Assembly symmetry: C2
Homo-oligomer: 142 residues x 2
Amino acid sequence: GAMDLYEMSKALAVGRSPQDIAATSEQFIASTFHARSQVLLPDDNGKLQPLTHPQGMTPWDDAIAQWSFDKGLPAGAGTDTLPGVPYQILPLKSGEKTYGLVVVEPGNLRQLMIPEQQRLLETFTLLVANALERLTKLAAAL
Amino acid sequence: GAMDLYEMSKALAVGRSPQDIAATSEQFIASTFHARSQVLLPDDNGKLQPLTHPQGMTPWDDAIAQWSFDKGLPAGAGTDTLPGVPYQILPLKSGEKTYGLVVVEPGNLRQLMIPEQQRLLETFTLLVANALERLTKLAAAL
């Protein structure tokens, strides 16, 4: 919806931990895009977590997810890497830096892949990345 | 343009000071929205600076700008406060917190006030606010 980005922005603004941000991002991306989603965040070694998938989502390839994060490039539907899977693997990027990934598995892939929807989803991932960037840089400072 | 938000996001990501962010924001808002713009930032006392206007912009009311910042509400064209002026005064807000303002004076006010353009401009102000929030919170931490 028209107001969802603004509403998510308010919810992200008060997130206090990466988990808060991940939960908020999943809530909003799941409702606005009629999808199940999972945010993956790098650990101390730059390895994405969780390695498990939630009930209701199709398992994705963990190594291709790691590739997406490492290269800051999308994979899955809409790309030439795993073009046939029923989900998207999207980097959460601010500038050239990737702070995490979101895996998005829509109830209706043709609906998610409508270009206007893709452009909206890109804006959502930017706002999520900004929140992750803020929390990571603040934690490091402190 | 379609790609301007993403491009501004990349430029904001590498901003190192509020002045960097202000300059970037003015560059992009001015080009994407065919407008002149000025970002105003609070000083130590929460008073907006600069108090002067650049060549090429109509002078705005400094106290109404301060009102907009203090209340986190827009003024100028499109609002019931100074509805007749040829510019907008927009808070740069992340969540409930306002980090600054942007004054936007378009070459063609009817074009700027097209609702789709307003919705795009709102997204721009969100990204700018996020950058200001990041820099302010980091400076405070350090």
